[PDB]
């Protein structure tokens, strides 16, 4: 029931968060269940930056980092500020096409052409849920690597032979089945992307408590001293 980074009780994090806002009705506040505080998310992103930094410390050409609009902007901002190897960064807009046999990510022809040319290309997304998105991107850019703050089920992803070899840098896994997340850049029907904490609106209290129990112990065991230079 306490933030694993600051030590502030979640009730206090939320009392501060919800004080006199103009973007949520008092009656709606209870609908939002905090899964991870913004500070906890920042720790996860820093830990991910740490691993990418170690991986690319000797790279001889800038890495191509590419983030998918729009939600990943926040995570990308929390990740990139801690990276210490050369890279370029750009964002691309893709559309999800739900076919009768599979869901596919449709890129701008030019964007895709450019990416397929780079040796080191890392797709940044804040959340890998069903994995259909990265599964599609993967089959279009076979050498692409993935960097995601949250991954619902890594094992499920690795089950696919196509992704079994793909390098993935992620902050935390697994995420609760039956959840629906908003905040941390993810929209609530277009709104609240800037609600920095990661909230859920579909889980039971017990499920939220269990998720935090596991997240908290994971964060307390992290060693990211020095990663943040600011």
The annotation places the binding site for Mg(2+) at 125-126, 187
Nearest to 153 by CA among 134, 172, 179, 166: 172
- Tell me the C-alpha distance between 45 and 126, whole Å: 10
> Smaller CB distance to Mg ion: residue 5 or 169?
169
Minimum Å gap between C-beta 7 and ligand IMU is 28
> Smaller CB distance to a copy of itself: residue 52 or 128?
52
Show Cβ contacts of residue 204 under 8 Å, excluding neighbours closer than 6 positions: none
Determine, following the binding rule CB under 8 A, whether residue 196 of this chain makes contact with a copy of itself.
yes
Determine, following the binding rule CB under 8 A, whether residue 69 of this chain makes contact with a copy of itself.
yes
- Residues facing 88 on adjacent strands: 64
Determine, following the binding rule CB under 5 A, whether residue 183 of this chain makes contact with Mg ion.
no
Minimum Å gap between C-beta 140 and ligand IMU is 14
Among 34, 44, 52, 74, binds a copy of itself (CB under 8 A): 74
Which listed option, Mg ion, a copy of itself, ligand IMU, none, makes contact with residue 16 (CB within 5 to 8 Å by class)? a copy of itself
Strand locations in the chain (E): 33-36, 63-68, 87-92, 95-98, 103-106, 121-128, 145-151, 168-172, 181-182, 198-200
Residues 168 and 145: beta-carbon distance below 8 Å = yes
Site for a copy of itself in 32-61 (CB under 8 A): 37-39, 53, 56-59
Count of positions on this chain that bind a copy of itself (CB under 8 A): 50
Minimum Å gap between C-beta 160 and ligand IMU is 12
117, with CB counted inside 10 A (0-12, 13-18, 19+), is: exposed
> Smaller CB distance to a copy of itself: residue 24 or 222?
24
Among the candidate windows 77-85, 138-146, 164-172, 205-213, which touches a copy of itself by CB under 8 A?
77-85
Which listed option, a copy of itself, Mg ion, ligand IMU, none, makes contact with residue 180 (CB within 5 to 8 Å by class)? ligand IMU
> Smaller CB distance to a copy of itself: residue 25 or 164?
25
Determine, following the binding rule CB under 8 A, whether residue 118 of this chain makes contact with a copy of itself.
no
């Amino acid at each position: 029931m306490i933030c694993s980074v600051t030590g502030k009780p979640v009730k206090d994090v939320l009392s501060t968060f919800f004080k006199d806002r103009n973007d949520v009705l008092e009656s709606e506040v209870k609908k939002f269940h905090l899964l991870a505080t913004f500070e906890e998310c920042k720790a996860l992103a820093a830990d991910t930056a740490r691993r990418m930094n170690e991986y690319y410390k000797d790279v001889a050409e800038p890495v191509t980092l590419v983030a998918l609009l729009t939600g990943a902007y926040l995570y990308a901002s929390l990740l990139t500020v801690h990276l210490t190897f050369p890279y370029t960064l750009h964002f691309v807009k893709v559309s999800s096409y739900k076919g009768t046999r599979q869901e596919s990510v449709v890129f701008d022809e030019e964007d895709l052409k450019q990416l397929k040319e780079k040796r080191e290309v890392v797709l940044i997304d804040e959340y890998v849920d069903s994995g259909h998105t990265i599964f599609s991107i993967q089959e279009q850019i076979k050498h692409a690597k993935i960097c995601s703050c949250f991954v619902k089920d890594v094992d499920a992803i690795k089950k696919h032979s196509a992704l079994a070899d793909t390098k993935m840098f992620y902050g935390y896994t697994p995420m609760p089945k039956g959840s629906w997340l908003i905040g941390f850049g993810l929209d609530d029907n277009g709104l609240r992307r800037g609600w920095a904490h990661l909230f859920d609106i579909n889980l039971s209290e017990s499920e939220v408590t269990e998720f935090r129990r596991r997240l908290t112990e994971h964060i307390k065991g992290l060693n990211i001293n020095g990663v943040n230079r600011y």
